[PDB]
Amino acid sequence: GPVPSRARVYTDVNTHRPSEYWDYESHVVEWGNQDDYQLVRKLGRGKYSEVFEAINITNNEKVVVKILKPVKKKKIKREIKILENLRGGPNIITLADIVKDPVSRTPALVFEHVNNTDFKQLYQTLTDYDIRFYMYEILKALDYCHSMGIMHRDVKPHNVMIDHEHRKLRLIDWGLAEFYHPGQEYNVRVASRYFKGPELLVDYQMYDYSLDMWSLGCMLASMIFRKEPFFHGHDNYDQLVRIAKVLGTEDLYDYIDKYNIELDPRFNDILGRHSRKRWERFVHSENQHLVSPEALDFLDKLLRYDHQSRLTAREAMEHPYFYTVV
Ligand SMILES: NCCCCNCc1ccc(-c2ccccc2)c(Cl)c1
Ligand SMILES: NCCCCNCc1ccc(-c2ccccc2)c(Cl)c1
The missing domain is CATH 1.10.510.10 (Transferase(Phosphotransferase) domain 1)
Structure with a gap:
């Protein structure tokens, strides 16, 4: 072989x-408040994602919201764990929050703008x-x-x-x-x-x-x-x-x-x-x-x-x- x-x-x-x-499968996710964020416009469309420009209404700061089509939970957990691990690394996008839409049952990642x-x-x-x-x-x-x-x-x-x-x-x-x-x-x-x-x-x-x-x-x-x-x-x-x-x-x-x-x-x-x-x-x-x-x-x-x-x-x-x- x-x-x-x-x-x-x-x-x-x-x-x-x-x-x-x-072991990202054992990582415990903790949601923030989706109500803290107001979506402004669509930035792009991925295979199983939609990226939006948003505003965090609690500090009037612009953020980026990545809404994920939850086709594989394992893959979402992997991305979250990796982002958490690399948070603060040079030139790495900063994961600022993780939120969920309870009605559509959809997770979203919130990043620095x-x-x-x-x-x-x-x-x-x-x-x-x-x-x-x-x-x-x-x-x-x-x-x-x-x-x-x-x-x-x-x-x-x-x-x-x-x-x-x-x-x-x-x-x-x-x-x-x-x-x-x-x-x-x-x-x-x-x-x-x-x-x-x-x-x-x-x-x-x-x-x-x-x-x-x-x-x-x-x-x-x-x-x-x-x-x-x-x-x-x-x-x-x-x-x-x-x-x-x-x-x-x-x-x-x-x-x-x-x-x-x-x-x-x-x-x-x-x-x-x-x-x-x-x-x-x-x-x-x-x-x-x-x-x-x-x-x-x-x-x-x-x-x-x-x-x-x-x-x-x-x-x-x-x-x-x-x-x-x-
Ligand atoms: N009167 C309440 C004002 C804030 C409303 N929240 C807007 C909002 C709702 C849902 C979401 C959302 C969408 C898809 C997946 C996860 C989260 C967001 Cl980012 C923002
Ligand atoms: N999905 C958001 C669109 C991002 C577009 N990227 C712009 C971009 C512009 C220039 C470069 C670039 C600069 C120097 C050397 C090689 C490449 C890149 Cl990687 C990216």
């Missing part, structure tokens, strides 16, 4: 902690420095949650809120987040298609925090190259082919050989043969002002098939690409 794997960092953080920290600036207008005003600045803020969030034994598993631009006026960044939507336990086999149906790590696509279940580092690499490539998304798969199988068109098929076979992975038969007629591309091939007139040798070197160390060969969040923070940031 497949060769086992474990995280190179924070491997045993949950092993050395008591069950109260990671983040004034998100428009992402489409944020493009082409962003400089090389801004990308390095905001990439560093995301790394602080990831190094923190990984150090807390938690994998986000849904890193993408939709899950990163930026208040550009105050240079404030928050990593949000911890609904797919999970406790890392060495040796555990996780569900590969996590992250959004374009941000899915090769481990998920080849059905390698013993993954870790390094999955978030791949997703972060997809975001960096799309920002510096002005190509959204960077890896444009039309399905989960085609997503690996899009990756293989860049990283090449040679290294892909080295990765599946190292972990003794069996490729799904669906990859037989679509994978083909692809040479390893130079990152400099993606440089064009519209993006060259955001690209540098240090950005390319950093990108090359995140976008690796081998999850163990990717920079951890702390190693990434020490990369020359971030020498210009505080």
Whole structure:
């Protein structure tokens, strides 16, 4: 069968902690008052959620209310426990309350308000420095949650809120987040298609925090190259082919050989043969002002098939690409 794997960092953080920290099914939820909050407007719509801007009428402070379609109670408890565990961590969205609607029998999470600036207008005003600045803020969030034994598993631009006026960044939507336990086999149906790590696509279940580092690499490539998304798969199988068109098929076979992975038969007629591309091939007139040798070197160390060969969040923070940031 497949060769086992474990995280190179924070491997045993949950092993050395008591069950109260990671056994989310045993966590006791305590509701606040739904009457403290007045809904203002709809911000977005998720698979099993609706996000609203609200006002806490007891202090006249704006908040964010995430109403959850309670399709799986276990999943709601997981998200609540993780949010409670990470509360106060750098650039982590702050869970301020948990409320219930008794008539519809619906739970809601109340968060600190983040004034998100428009992402489409944020493009082409962003400089090389801004990308390095905001990439560093995301790394602080990831190094923190990984150090807390938690994998986000849904890193993408939709899950990163930026208040550009105050240079404030928050990593949000911890609904797919999970406790890392060495040796555990996780569900590969996590992250959004374009941000899915090769481990998920080849059905390698013993993954870790390094999955978030791949997703972060997809975001960096799309920002510096002005190509959204960077890896444009039309399905989960085609997503690996899009990756293989860049990283090449040679290294892909080295990765599946190292972990003794069996490729799904669906990859037989679509994978083909692809040479390893130079990152400099993606440089064009519209993006060259955001690209540098240090950005390319950093990108090359995140976008690796081998999850163990990717920079951890702390190693990434020490990369020359971030020498210009505080
Ligand atoms: N006269 C009472 C004024 C406050 C009314 N409360 C508004 C309110 C009602 C329900 C909810 C709610 C909706 C879905 C799930 C969980 C909670 C909220 Cl956030 C707010
Ligand atoms: N679901 C709420 C919508 C949030 C939109 N996110 C805006 C955003 C803007 C820029 C970025 C960004 C900045 C620097 C480097 C890479 C990415 C992100 Cl992650 C996110």
